[PDB]
């Protein structure tokens, strides 16, 4: 009889991955969410254990919106899933889409919904803000971002902004964009000349240290065929923050 | 659905709507299995339901439904 077995290749093949994936969004939403925590004393060590209670989603909450939200103060697995309820509660007020995310799955820890949780939250706090010169009508936040991206970046040579995924991955977009803004920041003939991982090593330390933009990427992550999207759109947003 | 063709196009390697049995042992190699090619042909077979001898993206489907 049947053995399953190209399905079983199919699963390792798309399980490895899904689980890249995850572990490339954790490590981005992990420092994004802890360059908001920090204004409140608070640090996130492992996204998929140090959310469950719901205090540090509440507090993350607090300071991107700089209200005062309710907070459960007991200590049992009631508690936490009304703790994390509260969070839940506060975004769907404000209609922020999040589909199958339940107080369950981030009280139990679940990869896919805990880091779908962060997307929603950087999406409607930080990546929706934007408004780009130029922008048509029903354009997404996303389609503004991506056009913001392609003005910054004309009139380099060979530079092309045609996704957030691939067009991404060999540093020279993030070196031309910080360029454009303060071009002593920038040497572009070393960035012509340079390796994919030494441009985005300088332009993420560049952003840093002179733009104030956290790292939230690293140039391994990005350097390779297929760049997480959420990830990168999540740091170019950061880019744009930086520069009024 | 979406995420189904993503994990076609990891096999699909010349984007053709196909898969080989060269493209299933190019995967699985990548991912540190050593696969015959009778074993290939054997997988392909399974779920080949035209008998073409490749899978296309509906028998990938049927397959993983
Ligand atoms: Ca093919
Ligand atoms: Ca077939
Ligand atoms: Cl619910
Ligand atoms: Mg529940």
């Given at each position: 009889?049947?053995?399953?077995?190209?399905?079983?290749?199919?699963?390792?093949?798309?399980?490895?991955?899904?689980?890249?994936?995850?572990?490339?969004?954790?490590?981005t939403f992990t420092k994004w969410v802890n360059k908001?925590?920090?204004?409140?004393?608070?640090?996130?060590?492992?996204?998929?254990?140090?959310?469950?209670?719901?205090?540090?989603?509440?507090?993350?909450?607090?300071?991107?919106?700089?209200?005062?939200?309710?907070?459960?103060?007991?200590?049992?697995?009631?508690?936490?899933?009304?703790?994390?309820?509260?969070?839940?509660?506060?975004?769907?007020?404000?209609?922020?889409?999040?589909?199958?995310?339940?107080?369950?799955?981030?009280?139990?820890?679940?990869?896919?919904?805990?880091?779908?949780?962060?997307?929603?939250?950087?999406?409607?706090?930080?990546?929706?803000?934007?408004?780009?010169?130029?922008?048509?009508?029903?354009?997404?936040?996303?389609?503004?971002?991506?056009?913001?991206?392609?003005?910054?970046?004309?009139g380099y040579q060979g530079l092309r902004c045609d996704?957030?995924?691939?067009?991404?991955?060999?540093?020279?977009?993030?070196?031309?964009?910080?360029?454009?803004?303060?071009?002593?920041?920038?040497?572009?003939?070393?960035?012509?000349?340079?390796?994919?991982?030494?441009?985005?090593?300088?332009?993420?330390?560049?952003?840093?240290?002179?733009?104030?933009?956290?790292?939230?990427?690293?140039?391994?992550?990005?350097?390779?065929?297929?760049?997480?999207?959420?990830?990168?759109?999540?740091?170019?947003?950061?880019?744009?923050?930086?520069?009024? | 659905?979406?995420?189904?063709?993503?994990?076609?196009?990891?096999?699909?390697?010349?984007?053709?709507?196909?898969?080989?049995?060269?493209?299933?042992?190019?995967?699985?190699?990548?991912?540190?299995?050593?696969?015959?090619?009778?074993?290939?042909?054997?997988?392909?077979?399974?779920?080949?339901?035209?008998?073409?001898?490749?899978?296309?993206?509906?028998?990938?489907?049927?397959?993983?439904?």
């Amino acid at each position: 009889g049947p053995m399953d077995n190209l399905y079983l290749a199919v699963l390792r093949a798309s399980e490895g991955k899904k689980d890249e994936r995850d572990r490339v969004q954790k490590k981005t939403f992990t420092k994004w969410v802890n360059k908001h925590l920090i204004k409140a004393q608070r640090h996130i060590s492992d996204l998929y254990e140090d959310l469950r209670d719901g205090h540090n989603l509440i507090s993350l909450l607090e300071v991107l919106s700089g209200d005062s939200l309710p907070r459960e103060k007991g200590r049992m697995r009631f508690h936490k899933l009304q703790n994390v309820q509260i969070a839940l509660d506060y975004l769907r007020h404000r209609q922020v889409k999040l589909v199958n995310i339940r107080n369950d799955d981030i009280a139990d820890g679940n990869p896919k919904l805990t880091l779908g949780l962060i997307w929603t939250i950087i999406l409607h706090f930080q990546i929706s803000d934007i408004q780009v010169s130029g922008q048509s009508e029903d354009m997404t936040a996303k389609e503004k971002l991506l056009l913001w991206s392609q003005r910054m970046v004309e009139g380099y040579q060979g530079l092309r902004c045609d996704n957030f995924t691939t067009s991404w991955r060999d540093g020279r977009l993030f070196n031309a964009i910080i360029h454009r803004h303060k071009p002593m920041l920038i040497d572009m003939n070393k960035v012509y000349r340079q390796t994919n991982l030494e441009n985005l090593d300088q332009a993420f330390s560049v952003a840093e240290r002179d733009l104030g933009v956290t790292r939230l990427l690293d140039p391994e992550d990005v350097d390779v065929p297929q760049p997480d999207e959420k990830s990168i759109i999540t740091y170019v947003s950061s880019l744009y923050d930086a520069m009024p | 659905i979406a995420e189904f063709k993503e994990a076609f196009s990891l096999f699909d390697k010349d984007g053709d709507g196909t898969i080989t049995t060269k493209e299933l042992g190019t995967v699985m190699r990548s991912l540190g299995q050593n696969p015959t090619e009778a074993e290939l042909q054997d997988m392909i077979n399974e779920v080949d339901a035209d008998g073409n001898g490749t899978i296309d993206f509906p028998e990938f489907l049927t397959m993983m439904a």
